[PDB]
Amino acid sequence: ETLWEIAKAEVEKRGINAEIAEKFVFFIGSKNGGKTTIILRCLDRDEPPKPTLALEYTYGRRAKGHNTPKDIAHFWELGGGTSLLDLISIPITGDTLRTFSLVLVLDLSKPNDLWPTMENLLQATKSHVDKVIMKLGKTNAKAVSEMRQKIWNNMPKDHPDHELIDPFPVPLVIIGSKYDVFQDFESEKRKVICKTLRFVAHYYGASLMFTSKSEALLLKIRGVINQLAFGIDKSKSICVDQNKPLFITAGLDSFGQIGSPMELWKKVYEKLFPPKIKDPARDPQYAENEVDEMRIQKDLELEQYKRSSSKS
Amino acid sequence: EVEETLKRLQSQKGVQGIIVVNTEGIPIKSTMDNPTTTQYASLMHSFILKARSTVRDIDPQNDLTFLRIRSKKNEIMVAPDKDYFLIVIQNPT
Amino acid sequence: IDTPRLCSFLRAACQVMAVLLEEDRLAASDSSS
């Protein structure tokens, strides 16, 4: 009697705070943007990138040195303006929102042609994460209030919190890809690109860093968001001056200095680059028994799948 | 093909309903209401079995070739099967 | 039921019904045209 009641009382008392729910990060990008290589490097692997992308799943483990806690970091990704919410809604659940972070990768090749891709994916994530905080019917939402106040008091750490330029309730880091093309851009094009790259970071309060092979900052900064996988914050100064490397600590990039909105984007868009069938009929085809059976199969299988009454 | 023929048959003023009973009283296709669909499939399943037994009892080397049962309300026809048969109901009037 | 190997029965059943219906259709001193 009292033996199990107390045992129950202890597992009830405990349960607030192997490791506690591990974090995971999702990679917004395009298809064949080089982002697969970036992810695989975050896993500290040398494997050739996979062509396809359909919520690819991979993870790894880290230790601390006093022990091996087996800190697992999960990785999810999607590329291109394909099945936006149908797939974005899959790896993201409200129960783990506080443990969820985004990183957005942009191919420098054609920022304009890539902009609707990342924008659509980003909107899908933004809308989704905003809802799941209470869509689950989380009555005891105190945690929801706490975690939101954390996110919107991490970047305006010291600077007076004048306004939340865009309430964005999930961590975000932004980075380009294949900067090898940037050195070959026209001076005028590099400048207008810099305006938007600088702006978008401070707009979301998302840090920036470069991407290369010898560049350890990529692994380091990614590691921080990935459960300190490659160290700690190690906040450095903004590199808006050199423009050769890339690095921005969110909070030091005040608009008045880095930009010096709608008009900014419109201007950069116009200057940088403005030029931004299934045949179900099967008419040139014929068959008699093959098409008759296919019609039969279609009906019978479709009705069977409905009858399964799956809750999924 | 078969679906088009069934529709054409159903369009005939004589036909009052068609049931495709597959797994021994379990239908998949019907042009009738659910209570009648289930009852009719069951009844004709039992009924045809009785006729087949009757024929074998008359002669131990012959099976059913066709079975028809008539009533004042409607008339029902079934055919022998290996795996499943089909049910047709018509108004003889 | 998914297999045409069984749908053959469905065809045959339709053929019987069609003929029976056709048979059922065979129902009934000066100018009356």
PDB file of all heavy atoms in Angstrom, chain A residues 139-158, unseen atoms left out:
ATOM      1  N   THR A 139      -3.506  23.828 -22.133  1.00  0.00           N
ATOM      2  CA  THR A 139      -4.124  24.668 -21.114  1.00  0.00           C
ATOM      3  C   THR A 139      -3.080  25.317 -20.223  1.00  0.00           C
ATOM      4  O   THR A 139      -3.060  26.544 -20.067  1.00  0.00           O
ATOM      5  CB  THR A 139      -5.106  23.856 -20.248  1.00  0.00           C
ATOM      6  N   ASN A 140      -2.189  24.513 -19.644  1.00  0.00           N
ATOM      7  CA  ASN A 140      -1.114  25.036 -18.807  1.00  0.00           C
ATOM      8  C   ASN A 140      -0.045  25.667 -19.707  1.00  0.00           C
ATOM      9  O   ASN A 140       1.072  25.176 -19.858  1.00  0.00           O
ATOM     10  CB  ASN A 140      -0.521  23.948 -17.930  1.00  0.00           C
ATOM     11  N   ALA A 141      -0.420  26.803 -20.303  1.00  0.00           N
ATOM     12  CA  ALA A 141       0.417  27.518 -21.262  1.00  0.00           C
ATOM     13  C   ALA A 141       1.466  28.406 -20.613  1.00  0.00           C
ATOM     14  O   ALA A 141       2.135  29.163 -21.333  1.00  0.00           O
ATOM     15  CB  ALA A 141      -0.456  28.367 -22.186  1.00  0.00           C
ATOM     16  N   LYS A 142       1.631  28.353 -19.290  1.00  0.00           N
ATOM     17  CA  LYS A 142       2.653  29.194 -18.678  1.00  0.00           C
ATOM     18  C   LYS A 142       3.983  29.006 -19.385  1.00  0.00           C
ATOM     19  O   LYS A 142       4.729  29.968 -19.572  1.00  0.00           O
ATOM     20  CB  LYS A 142       2.796  28.878 -17.189  1.00  0.00           C
ATOM     21  N   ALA A 143       4.321  27.764 -19.736  1.00  0.00           N
ATOM     22  CA  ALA A 143       5.579  27.519 -20.431  1.00  0.00           C
ATOM     23  C   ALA A 143       5.621  28.263 -21.752  1.00  0.00           C
ATOM     24  O   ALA A 143       6.689  28.699 -22.194  1.00  0.00           O
ATOM     25  CB  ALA A 143       5.784  26.021 -20.650  1.00  0.00           C
ATOM     26  N   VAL A 144       4.470  28.390 -22.411  1.00  0.00           N
ATOM     27  CA  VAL A 144       4.417  29.073 -23.697  1.00  0.00           C
ATOM     28  C   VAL A 144       4.778  30.539 -23.522  1.00  0.00           C
ATOM     29  O   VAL A 144       5.585  31.094 -24.276  1.00  0.00           O
ATOM     30  CB  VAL A 144       3.012  28.957 -24.316  1.00  0.00           C
ATOM     31  N   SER A 145       4.209  31.173 -22.494  1.00  0.00           N
ATOM     32  CA  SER A 145       4.549  32.562 -22.206  1.00  0.00           C
ATOM     33  C   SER A 145       6.028  32.721 -21.868  1.00  0.00           C
ATOM     34  O   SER A 145       6.679  33.659 -22.338  1.00  0.00           O
ATOM     35  CB  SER A 145       3.702  33.075 -21.056  1.00  0.00           C
ATOM     36  N   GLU A 146       6.583  31.803 -21.075  1.00  0.00           N
ATOM     37  CA  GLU A 146       7.990  31.907 -20.694  1.00  0.00           C
ATOM     38  C   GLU A 146       8.899  31.778 -21.902  1.00  0.00           C
ATOM     39  O   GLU A 146       9.811  32.585 -22.094  1.00  0.00           O
ATOM     40  CB  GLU A 146       8.347  30.835 -19.663  1.00  0.00           C
ATOM     41  N   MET A 147       8.678  30.757 -22.724  1.00  0.00           N
ATOM     42  CA  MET A 147       9.598  30.527 -23.831  1.00  0.00           C
ATOM     43  C   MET A 147       9.526  31.653 -24.863  1.00  0.00           C
ATOM     44  O   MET A 147      10.548  32.023 -25.460  1.00  0.00           O
ATOM     45  CB  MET A 147       9.299  29.182 -24.490  1.00  0.00           C
ATOM     46  N   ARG A 148       8.345  32.253 -25.058  1.00  0.00           N
ATOM     47  CA  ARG A 148       8.249  33.363 -25.998  1.00  0.00           C
ATOM     48  C   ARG A 148       8.991  34.583 -25.474  1.00  0.00           C
ATOM     49  O   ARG A 148       9.683  35.269 -26.232  1.00  0.00           O
ATOM     50  CB  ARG A 148       6.794  33.727 -26.252  1.00  0.00           C
ATOM     51  N   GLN A 149       8.899  34.851 -24.172  1.00  0.00           N
ATOM     52  CA  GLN A 149       9.612  35.988 -23.616  1.00  0.00           C
ATOM     53  C   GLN A 149      11.113  35.766 -23.653  1.00  0.00           C
ATOM     54  O   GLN A 149      11.875  36.726 -23.724  1.00  0.00           O
ATOM     55  CB  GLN A 149       9.158  36.254 -22.177  1.00  0.00           C
ATOM     56  N   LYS A 150      11.558  34.513 -23.601  1.00  0.00           N
ATOM     57  CA  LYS A 150      12.982  34.243 -23.752  1.00  0.00           C
ATOM     58  C   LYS A 150      13.444  34.613 -25.152  1.00  0.00           C
ATOM     59  O   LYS A 150      14.422  35.345 -25.323  1.00  0.00           O
ATOM     60  CB  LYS A 150      13.289  32.772 -23.464  1.00  0.00           C
ATOM     61  N   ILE A 151      12.727  34.136 -26.170  1.00  0.00           N
ATOM     62  CA  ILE A 151      13.165  34.367 -27.542  1.00  0.00           C
ATOM     63  C   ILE A 151      13.287  35.861 -27.827  1.00  0.00           C
ATOM     64  O   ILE A 151      14.260  36.307 -28.446  1.00  0.00           O
ATOM     65  CB  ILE A 151      12.190  33.728 -28.547  1.00  0.00           C
ATOM     66  N   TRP A 152      12.325  36.663 -27.366  1.00  0.00           N
ATOM     67  CA  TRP A 152      12.284  38.083 -27.684  1.00  0.00           C
ATOM     68  C   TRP A 152      12.975  38.928 -26.632  1.00  0.00           C
ATOM     69  O   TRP A 152      12.709  40.132 -26.539  1.00  0.00           O
ATOM     70  CB  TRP A 152      10.834  38.548 -27.834  1.00  0.00           C
ATOM     71  N   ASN A 153      13.810  38.312 -25.804  1.00  0.00           N
ATOM     72  CA  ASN A 153      14.705  39.044 -24.921  1.00  0.00           C
ATOM     73  C   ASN A 153      16.115  38.472 -24.973  1.00  0.00           C
ATOM     74  O   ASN A 153      16.906  38.732 -24.060  1.00  0.00           O
ATOM     75  CB  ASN A 153      14.177  39.034 -23.499  1.00  0.00           C
ATOM     76  N   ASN A 154      16.436  37.674 -25.989  1.00  0.00           N
ATOM     77  CA  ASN A 154      17.788  37.171 -26.181  1.00  0.00           C
ATOM     78  C   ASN A 154      18.620  38.063 -27.088  1.00  0.00           C
ATOM     79  O   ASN A 154      19.811  38.254 -26.829  1.00  0.00           O
ATOM     80  CB  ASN A 154      17.747  35.756 -26.728  1.00  0.00           C
ATOM     81  N   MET A 155      18.039  38.589 -28.165  1.00  0.00           N
ATOM     82  CA  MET A 155      18.774  39.503 -29.032  1.00  0.00           C
ATOM     83  C   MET A 155      18.844  40.903 -28.422  1.00  0.00           C
ATOM     84  O   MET A 155      19.950  41.448 -28.307  1.00  0.00           O
ATOM     85  CB  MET A 155      18.126  39.552 -30.415  1.00  0.00           C
ATOM     86  N   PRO A 156      17.717  41.527 -27.977  1.00  0.00           N
ATOM     87  CA  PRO A 156      17.828  42.858 -27.354  1.00  0.00           C
ATOM     88  C   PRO A 156      18.282  42.711 -25.905  1.00  0.00           C
ATOM     89  O   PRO A 156      17.566  43.038 -24.949  1.00  0.00           O
ATOM     90  CB  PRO A 156      16.408  43.422 -27.449  1.00  0.00           C
ATOM     91  N   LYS A 157      19.497  42.189 -25.762  1.00  0.00           N
ATOM     92  CA  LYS A 157      20.059  41.843 -24.467  1.00  0.00           C
ATOM     93  C   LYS A 157      20.363  43.092 -23.654  1.00  0.00           C
ATOM     94  O   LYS A 157      20.049  43.171 -22.462  1.00  0.00           O
ATOM     95  CB  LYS A 157      21.326  41.002 -24.639  1.00  0.00           C
ATOM     96  N   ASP A 158      20.989  44.076 -24.287  1.00  0.00           N
ATOM     97  CA  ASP A 158      21.374  45.312 -23.640  1.00  0.00           C
ATOM     98  C   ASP A 158      20.705  46.527 -24.248  1.00  0.00           C
ATOM     99  O   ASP A 158      20.267  47.409 -23.502  1.00  0.00           O
ATOM    100  CB  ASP A 158      22.893  45.485 -23.700  1.00  0.00           C
TER     101      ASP A 158
END
